[PDB]
Structure 1
Amino acid sequence: LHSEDYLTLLAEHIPLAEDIKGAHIYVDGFYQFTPQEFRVLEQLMVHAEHITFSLTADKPSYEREPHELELFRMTGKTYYRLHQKAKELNLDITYKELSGTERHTKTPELAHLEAQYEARPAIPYAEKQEALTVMQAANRRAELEGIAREIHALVREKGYRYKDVAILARQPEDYKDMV
């Protein structure tokens, strides 16, 4: 059994399985699906009782795919295809959009960054700087030790715990050993 035949085999046994029939299904965290995953998704759309697709996008349209330069290109395309197949199988469809921002209600700068990310031309931010910091390091070693000091400050003085902090890299291999 090829390791990629699981999703295929799953898709053709879902109608056969009884437990699926009355199930509620929530899918989230995905940006896009492989066709092989999509087959599973539509099969769930058929034999499950209900299914909710959570997608990160801004008023995506189910009529046409996004323009390539659109921020929400991936998710937008996903929405278009998912909605298309939902209408294809005559599902009763319910749409809910979350206009409000709940994550950055506490902090303004990041809400400004999230909202004005794509915007052209971008509107400047006139308030004080506190929570958004751009940092320049002499090297990667200094970058890491620096962030170490900042984390230590953040846990000693600002009542953060270590679990609240996250370090991301585009090319982790550049940093892991030194981290």
Structure 2
Amino acid sequence: LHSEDYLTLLAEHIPLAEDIKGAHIYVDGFYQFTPQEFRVLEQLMVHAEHITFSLTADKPSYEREPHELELFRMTGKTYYRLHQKAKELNLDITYKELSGTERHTKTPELAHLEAQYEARPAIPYAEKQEALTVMQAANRRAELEGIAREIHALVREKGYRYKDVAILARQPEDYKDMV
């Protein structure tokens, strides 16, 4: 058996798995899928009573694939493909578009970044700086050490908890040891 054999094995065993019939399924957190994972989803669309697909995008179309340069290329392309499969499979389809902000209701600037990220004819933010800050350090050492102080300021002063902070890096291999 191959690490990558389970998914193909799953896709063909789904039909005769009777407890997944009448099952409600939710998919979320995926930007895209592999053909193999795809094989599973469409096999789920057949034998499951309900399946909901959650995709991060902006009013995608199911007739045309996203152009090269648009932000929601991946998620849009997956929406178009998942929708065309549900169409050929003759499934009862329903749509739900989320318009308003939920995460950034109390944070205008972060709300600005999310909405104005794409459009090159981009409008500048006309308000005060508080939530968003860029910062320069002498080196990764000082960078983490500076961020470490910030985290303490946040938990000790602003009343946050450690579980509320998250630090990301495109190349964690560069900070992993020093962190």
1:11 aligns to 2:15 (yes or no): no
Tell me the alpha carbon deviations over residues 7-32 of structure 1, each in whole angstroms, 9 at most, x when there is no partner: 00101111101101110000000000
What do the CA deviations read for 1:70-116 (whole angstroms, capped 9, x no partner)? 00000000000000000010001001000011000011000000000
Deviations 1:8-58 (A, max 9, x none): 010111110110111000000000000000010000000000100000000
Tell me how many residue pairs correspond in the alignment.
179
- String of CA shifts for 1:158-177, please: whole Å, max 9, x gaps: 00000000000000000010
Q: Secondary structure at the match of 1:33?
A: coil
Q: CA RMSD in A?
A: 0.5
Question: Normalized against structure 2, the TM-score is what?
Answer: 0.99
CA distance in 1, matches of 2:82, 2:27: 12
Q: How many Å separate the matches in 1 of 2:53 and 2:68?
A: 22
TM-score with structure 1 setting the length:
0.99
2:74 maps to which residue?
A: 74
Displacement of 1:122 in angstroms is 1.1
Q: CA deviation at 1:121?
A: 1.6
Whole-Å separation in 1 of the counterparts to 2:102 and 2:165: 19
SS in 2 for 1:120: coil
Long gaps (5+) in structure 1: none
Q: Which runs of 4+ in 1 moved over 3 A?
A: none
Q: Secondary structure at the match of 1:169?
A: coil
Structure 2 match to 1:44: 44
1:105-135 CA distance string (max 9 Å, x none): 0110000000000011210111110000000
CA distance in 2, matches of 1:16, 1:159: 53
Structure 1: distance between partners of 2:90 and 2:9: 25
5+ long unaligned stretches in structure 2: none
Identical counterparts, % of pairs:
100
**Cα offset for 1:150?**
0.5
Separation (CA, whole Å) in 2 of partners of 1:38 and 1:133: 40
| SS across alignment from 2:13 | coil
1:113 aligns with 2:102: no
SS at 2:51's partner residue?
Answer: strand
